[PDB]
Amino acid sequence: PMYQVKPYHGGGAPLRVELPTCMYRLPNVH
Amino acid sequence: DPNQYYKIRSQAIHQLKVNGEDPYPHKFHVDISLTDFIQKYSHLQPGDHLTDITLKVAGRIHAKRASGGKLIFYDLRGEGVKLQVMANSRNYKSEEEFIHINNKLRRGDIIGVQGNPGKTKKGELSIIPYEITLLSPCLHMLPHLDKETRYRQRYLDLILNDFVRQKFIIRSKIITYIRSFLDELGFLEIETPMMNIIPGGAVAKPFITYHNELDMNLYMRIAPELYHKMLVVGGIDRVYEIGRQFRNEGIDLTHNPEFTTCEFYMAYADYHDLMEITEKMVSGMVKHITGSYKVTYHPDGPEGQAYDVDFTPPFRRINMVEELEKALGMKLPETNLFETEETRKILDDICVAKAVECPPPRTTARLLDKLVGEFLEVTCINPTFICDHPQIMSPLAKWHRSKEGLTERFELFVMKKEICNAYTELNDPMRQRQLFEEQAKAKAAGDDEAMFIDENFCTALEYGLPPTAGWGMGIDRVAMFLTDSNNIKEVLLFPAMKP
Amino acid sequence: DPNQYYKIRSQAIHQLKVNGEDPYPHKFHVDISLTDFIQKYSHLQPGDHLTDITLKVAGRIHAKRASGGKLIFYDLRGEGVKLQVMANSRNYKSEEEFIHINNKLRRGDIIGVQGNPGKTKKGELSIIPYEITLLSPCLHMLPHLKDKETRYRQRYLDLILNDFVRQKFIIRSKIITYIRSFLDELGFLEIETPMMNIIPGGAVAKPFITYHNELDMNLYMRIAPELYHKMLVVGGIDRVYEIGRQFRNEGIDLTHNPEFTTCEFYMAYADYHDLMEITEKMVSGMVKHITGSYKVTYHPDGPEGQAYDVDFTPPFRRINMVEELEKALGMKLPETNLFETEETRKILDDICVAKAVECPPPRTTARLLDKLVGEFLEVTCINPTFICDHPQIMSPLAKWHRSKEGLTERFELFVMKKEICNAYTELNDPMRQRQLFEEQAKAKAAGDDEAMFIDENFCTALEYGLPPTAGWGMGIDRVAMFLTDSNNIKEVLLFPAMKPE
Numbered sequence A: 001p002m003y004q005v006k007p008y009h010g011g012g013a014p015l016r017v018e019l020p021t022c023m024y025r026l027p028n029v030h
Numbered sequence B: 001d002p003n004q005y006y007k008i009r010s011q012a013i014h015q016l017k018v019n020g021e022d023p024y025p026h027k028f029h030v031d032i033s034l035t036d037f038i039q040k041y042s043h044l045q046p047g048d049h050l051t052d053i054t055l056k057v058a059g060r061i062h063a064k065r066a067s068g069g070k071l072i073f074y075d076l077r078g079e080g081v082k083l084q085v086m087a088n089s090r091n092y093k094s095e096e097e098f099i100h101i102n103n104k105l106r107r108g109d110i111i112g113v114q115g116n117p118g119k120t121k122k123g124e125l126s127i128i129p130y131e132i133t134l135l136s137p138c139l140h141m142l143p144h145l146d147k148e149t150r151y152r153q154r155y156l157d158l159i160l161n162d163f164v165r166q167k168f169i170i171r172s173k174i175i176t177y178i179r180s181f182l183d184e185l186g187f188l189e190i191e192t193p194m195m196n197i198i199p200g201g202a203v204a205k206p207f208i209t210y211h212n213e214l215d216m217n218l219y220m221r222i223a224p225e226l227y228h229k230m231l232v233v234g235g236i237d238r239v240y241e242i243g244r245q246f247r248n249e250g251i252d253l254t255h256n257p258e259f260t261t262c263e264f265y266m267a268y269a270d271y272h273d274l275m276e277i278t279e280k281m282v283s284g285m286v287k288h289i290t291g292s293y294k295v296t297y298h299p300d301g302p303e304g305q306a307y308d309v310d311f312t313p314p315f316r317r318i319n320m321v322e323e324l325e326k327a328l329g330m331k332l333p334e335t336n337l338f339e340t341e342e343t344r345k346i347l348d349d350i351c352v353a354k355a356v357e358c359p360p361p362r363t364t365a366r367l368l369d370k371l372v373g374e375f376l377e378v379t380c381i382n383p384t385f386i387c388d389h390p391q392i393m394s395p396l397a398k399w400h401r402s403k404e405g406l407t408e409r410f411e412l413f414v415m416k417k418e419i420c421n422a423y424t425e426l427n428d429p430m431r432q433r434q435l436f437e438e439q440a441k442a443k444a445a446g447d448d449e450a451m452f453i454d455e456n457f458c459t460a461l462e463y464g465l466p467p468t469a470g471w472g473m474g475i476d477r478v479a480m481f482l483t484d485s486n487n488i489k490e491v492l493l494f495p496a497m498k499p
Numbered sequence C: 001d002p003n004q005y006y007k008i009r010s011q012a013i014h015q016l017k018v019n020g021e022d023p024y025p026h027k028f029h030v031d032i033s034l035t036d037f038i039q040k041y042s043h044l045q046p047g048d049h050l051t052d053i054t055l056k057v058a059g060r061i062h063a064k065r066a067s068g069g070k071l072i073f074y075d076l077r078g079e080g081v082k083l084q085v086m087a088n089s090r091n092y093k094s095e096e097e098f099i100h101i102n103n104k105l106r107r108g109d110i111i112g113v114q115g116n117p118g119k120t121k122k123g124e125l126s127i128i129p130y131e132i133t134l135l136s137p138c139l140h141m142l143p144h145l146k147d148k149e150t151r152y153r154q155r156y157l158d159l160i161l162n163d164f165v166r167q168k169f170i171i172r173s174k175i176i177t178y179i180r181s182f183l184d185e186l187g188f189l190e191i192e193t194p195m196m197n198i199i200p201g202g203a204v205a206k207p208f209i210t211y212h213n214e215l216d217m218n219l220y221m222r223i224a225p226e227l228y229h230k231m232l233v234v235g236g237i238d239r240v241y242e243i244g245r246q247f248r249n250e251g252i253d254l255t256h257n258p259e260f261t262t263c264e265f266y267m268a269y270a271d272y273h274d275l276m277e278i279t280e281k282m283v284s285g286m287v288k289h290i291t292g293s294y295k296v297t298y299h300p301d302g303p304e305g306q307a308y309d310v311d312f313t314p315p316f317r318r319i320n321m322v323e324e325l326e327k328a329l330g331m332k333l334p335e336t337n338l339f340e341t342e343e344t345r346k347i348l349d350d351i352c353v354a355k356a357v358e359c360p361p362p363r364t365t366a367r368l369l370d371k372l373v374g375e376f377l378e379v380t381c382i383n384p385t386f387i388c389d390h391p392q393i394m395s396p397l398a399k400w401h402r403s404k405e406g407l408t409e410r411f412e413l414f415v416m417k418k419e420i421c422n423a424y425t426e427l428n429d430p431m432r433q434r435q436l437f438e439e440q441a442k443a444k445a446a447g448d449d450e451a452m453f454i455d456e457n458f459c460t461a462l463e464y465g466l467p468p469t470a471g472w473g474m475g476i477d478r479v480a481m482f483l484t485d486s487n488n489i490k491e492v493l494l495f496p497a498m499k500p501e
């Protein structure tokens, strides 16, 4: 097996991109 | 009558614009995908109607069915799924508007639907509209249920044929899997020129093009190989590129003028290392995408027999010269004699005796290629490494460390077709320049398949290319085997077509 | 001297082959990367020597220094890091082999080293070799401590000598990988569409032409994938993207190369308002992820000029093109629409003359407007700024604005006075699109060699119904320039196109 080389992403954690978001809604009490 | 349909619908849509009814509205606020709608509400009982939930969906009408005067069903499709729209006038915003929209809509139209989840008494999940909006009319009669039309109007193929989308999802999954595999091994994804002063790295007839401000011809690349090796001289030990290559040649079941390959180069690896990495990558890719190592394939299409192709590692290996001697039933010359005219004549006689055709020029490399295609490649059903090609057919591959006249090369064949080519890289600049000079002498003599000499590449090797192994894979051919396609046009969104 | 160096070293390496010493061995088994070696053994104290640990590493010799007759130091480099080789005669396999290997090696050679971790009394982490193997000699004098043209014509020398160069190409790869993760996570399908077309489309550019021999027809290298992507949305693939090469047959300058990389994506049921929000989230998130913050230093005129901090903190500023241009000019503009009209064109021509804004022929309404926007609006766009609502005459594939007559639902994102994104609600009415194509065909015959060809195949696809859709394109090379503090596009292309020497 070939020698280990760390990924260029750093190797810490998988990339988790920030995504667009939507403010939640609460139901009409009436 | 399709022509009459288009004239009539076009006039009707033009009338809607005149009347200010906006048949191409700018924005419709889709709330939920059809897929999520089906998942969220499949649990409903027949007859249910969730009057408190309202949602907006959109898609293309594939069917329209009236049921009495106050009820109409639309088969709404998108994302590879379908949802019934059950439009009854009792739930619509108003009876006058209900009549008006239903008279407007036709099969093929894109629509937005605002309404409630429900289930019919017969148990079909439905959305019950308060309002339907025409988003984009279809001016033509949508077809229902040759191959040229599917490839010349791929959007019609996608609308009609659910399997087509799935093939291109699989193709994308293959490429994304390969990037993940190599990124995890510490490779850097790079981009190298697609326009070159000297095409190289493969045997191919190139496209030529003129750059005006520079007043000089450029060639579209046939492979990125020589640039990647210069980057390894530059100290980037592991590089890869998934990108387009170009060949100015013929079109058939396994060739298109533009096609996609992955090449990678790995410092301090040899071709033994690359066989193990190939086995791990290819078997892991098949299992991840299909769920098992065994894939069904119809080499002759659905009209013929199918075979399970077994990708369980290790793959079979055969050595080209030894296996050819078995297939021919005769001893071939010693491999250190493969550069002689005596060996060329022996191969020429064998091709004549076996009725293996080889058009001129009848060079040793071309006669060997024809013999290998006839006698070895046809036995490679399951993934099979063909190894240790003669140097005379591998001008960029390093000489074999123990077999004189051979190289450290392999090709991976599946179902009789090449999917990978790889070798320990030739990194001795004197020997590489000598092989290029032989190529250039053959090119000047009339052999169009010979490579151009690349002086800048040979100079780069003079600065020291570490021992290295490189690899290329034809992505389209891999997508063919993983989609049960025997025609490359099935895995190209817009294949090149005779006009 | 460098010519003499090469002849002498080539002759020495040839003699190694004759003597059976194999100067290009097939395989050396590296145990550990230089980066991992440093991380594992940086903890050693000065004077440490781990005689029980034997490792194999490899790299390129960047310096060779003899210290008396029994000690030689090699500066071994790889992966952007360095490791001293402290070769002591007493720790080598034998004194005779020690003399032999040291007389063989030169600066620039690729070597493999088998030895123990150690640290000198001066505190320098080292490997102490039992055996060194020549893996690939450098036949030339390797340069030291360059000139811009040589750096681009021999990029491998630039990568060997200048650590900052590798870092720029790592950043470029991170940009692309970030964009794919963002679009994949939003449900987009990554697609590949033809790079050779009978009719180039989707942008304003002069194409490359090439000939296909079997089909006996000319083909054009693509200038944009845009029309293919919209046909796939007609086909029901709601979200598609492609990061790939485009081609323009023009001149070379600080922001222009004949081939370059873009990302385009198309999103059914979005409009350009949705795409501004997505652009702000993608670009700000990418900048913070790659650089660690929203603020980036940039030298628009290179290191000899002033630098500015560019602030990517969202939301980005928005300006409307025509109304902001009218404020910068101090005067109202004539209204434009789909048709070129000489009265309006003359007024804009007069404005450019009075303001000394150059416009080479043809001085069309769209080109004169573009030059005015470049002089008065783009120059104010230091932080990322959306310029919005372009006139229809500038935007033949953009949908008409739903509330502003004669404008379109378009934006461009400018950073440091340069365009990085172009996007719009897509025109999806086939009759209107055919009409705009007919206007482009007229302007081509009148002298505009960048004007679009009519594409009847694409108009036919629109007749089957393209859903309301918004699409977007980003110049990847320009983004890479801003995130690597490069003001020359050649800094972010591994092998930039170069005039023949």
Ligand SMILES: CP(=O)(O)OC[C@H]1O[C@@H](n2cnc3c(N)ncnc32)[C@H](O)[C@@H]1O
Pocket: B202, B203, B223, B245, B247, B254, B255, B256, B259, B261, B418, B421, B472, B473, B474, B475, B476, B477, B488
């Ligand atoms: C069969 P053979 O004579 O050995 O040629 C090997 C070459 O075929 C290339 N190639 C790969 N896939 C291709 C496809 N679909 N259409 C056309 N060419 C394709 C591949 O880069 C390699 O350089």
Ligand SMILES: N[C@@H](CCCC[NH3+])C(=O)O
Pocket: B201, B202, B203, B222, B223, B224, B225, B263, B421, B422, B423, B425, B469, B470, B471, B472, B473
């Ligand atoms: N450039 C080769 C693939 C890589 C071979 C190993 N350096 C080809 O076109 O087949």
Ligand SMILES: N[C@@H](CCCC[NH3+])C(=O)O
Pocket: C202, C203, C204, C223, C224, C225, C226, C264, C422, C423, C424, C426, C471, C472, C473, C474
């Ligand atoms: N094709 C455009 C980018 C996409 C515009 C939105 N459809 C360009 O070259 O600038």
Ligand SMILES: [Mg+2]
Pocket: B411, B418, B421
């Ligand atoms: Mg082959």
Ligand SMILES: [Mg+2]
Pocket: C412, C419, C422
């Ligand atoms: Mg622009």
